[PDB]
Design a protein around this ligand. Structure first.
Ligand SMILES: CC(C)=CCC/C(C)=C/CC/C(C)=C/CSP(=O)(O)OP(=O)(O)O
Ligand SMILES: CC(C)=CCC/C(C)=C/CC/C(C)=C/CSP(=O)(O)OP(=O)(O)O
Ligand SMILES: C=C(C)CCSP(=O)(O)OP(=O)(O)O
Ligand SMILES: C=C(C)CCSP(=O)(O)OP(=O)(O)O
Ligand SMILES: [Mg+2]
Ligand SMILES: [Mg+2]
Lengths: 203, 206
């Protein structure tokens, strides 16, 4: 589909993976592996329509306090997503608290933005991320927040039906238009993104 | 008033859509703000009746002060009248904003220290000549966040925005990190009790 106006930078909150799994009769931790292909599909659509920058919420510092079986699954799914995007022309950046045992060592290779292939889209991941860590990391202070290499967000899209930011990038979300999909993240469809983009061009 | 299982401790209000409301009625854009005063007082009356302990209103931003003088004078006048009218109720009032600016109305400097009027049944905060960057930069790394300009305003449970835009417009980025966000399509001067009741049903059903 054709759009009159496109956001320069979209933020994604891929919430609802545990509810999705429980609804399918799987264990709570089994939804995250079903969240990988939706991200790659979203990326593909963004390359096709020409979105310049996408930031995914991977996991928060609070999420690390979840049951180990869940953490290992969502961490493994974040690593696989990043690794897979590095094979398909993403310019990748991971932002999160690397001074923590909970930062996945496999993503230390991505903490300075790295072009893969043609670098068709800037893809950012928040991993072991907290708003408070971000702001206090730090007028040099605001330009020096931990997420300073992630620019202002135009459109934030959240799956899972919760209408909240969960502390995603408070500086970059000040003026973001927010679109909520009721379906859980693993039920992602191209129409969810097209509906958010219709909403955005109407603002 | 329904038998809520739970209420928000703190609601934030974004009373957007006043210029659109005015234009729809054939008025000049600046004339909508005076029609946003009584809706504020109605929202206060409902909050006191149902037991909401704390409300924060978005009064106007530093960016809003770049609008035409006739608009600025009207929304400043409407914010002054709102605060004064609320001072006749059982409200503990606090204004937060950049007072080191000729755009801060001198009439509201008195309310920069939280002040209990009558029985002080609800705490009401108002953001006047507010900007998120001014707030955060106002600020040990811990002391910094506890020392933001808006530090006397706690975490927001529920944010309700009129005028159909789904965005924060830089309202209190620290306090809104986890806020549930409810958007009413009607402009602020078309405030109805059911808008607040619908937002509260939404909040408790989360
Ligand atoms: C696309 C991408 C960034 C990576 C692929 C793997 C995924 C989807 C990671 C997200 C991890 C978490 C903790 C998301 C919240 S869903 P939840 O655990 O809060 O579930 P619930 O809301 O309880 O249903
Ligand atoms: C705080 C309170 C309860 C009442 C005091 C009077 C009012 C309603 C003041 C709010 C002032 C502003 C600038 C609101 C934005 S509506 P806008 O100018 O952006 O209108 P538009 O979105 O363009 O329709
Ligand atoms: C990694 C993310 C998708 C962000 C957190 S989604 P999470 O379920 O942790 O957030 P809340 O519903 O606000 O409790
Ligand atoms: C209600 C307020 C005082 C906050 C601003 S609503 P305003 O129209 O200024 O904000 P945007 O829609 O983001 O342009
Ligand atoms: Mg969740
Ligand atoms: Mg407006």
């Amino acid at each position: 589909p054709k759009f009159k106006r496109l956001p320069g930078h979209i933020a994604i909150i891929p919430d609802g993976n545990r509810r999705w799994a429980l609804d399918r009769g799987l264990e709570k931790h089994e939804g995250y592996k079903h969240g990988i292909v939706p991200g790659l599909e979203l990326y593909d659509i963004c390359v096709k329509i020409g979105i310049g920058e996408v930031t995914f919420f991977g996991f928060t510092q609070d999420n690390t306090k979840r049951p180990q079986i869940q953490r290992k699954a969502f961490v493994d799914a974040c690593i696989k997503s990043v690794k897979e995007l590095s094979k398909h022309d993403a310019e990748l950046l991971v932002v999160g608290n690397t001074n923590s045992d909970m930062f996945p060592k496999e993503l230390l290779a991505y903490t300075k933005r790295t072009k893969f292939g043609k670098g068709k889209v800037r893809i950012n991941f928040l991993v072991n991320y907290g708003w408070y860590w971000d702001l206090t990391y730090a007028k040099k202070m605001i330009e020096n927040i931990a997420s300073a290499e992630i620019p202002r967000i135009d459109l934030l899209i959240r799956w899972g039906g919760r209408r909240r930011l969960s502390g995603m990038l408070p500086v970059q979300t000040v003026y973001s238009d927010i679109y909520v999909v009721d379906e859980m993240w693993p039920d992602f469809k191209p129409e969810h993104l097209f509906n958010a983009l219709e909403f955005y061009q109407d603002q």
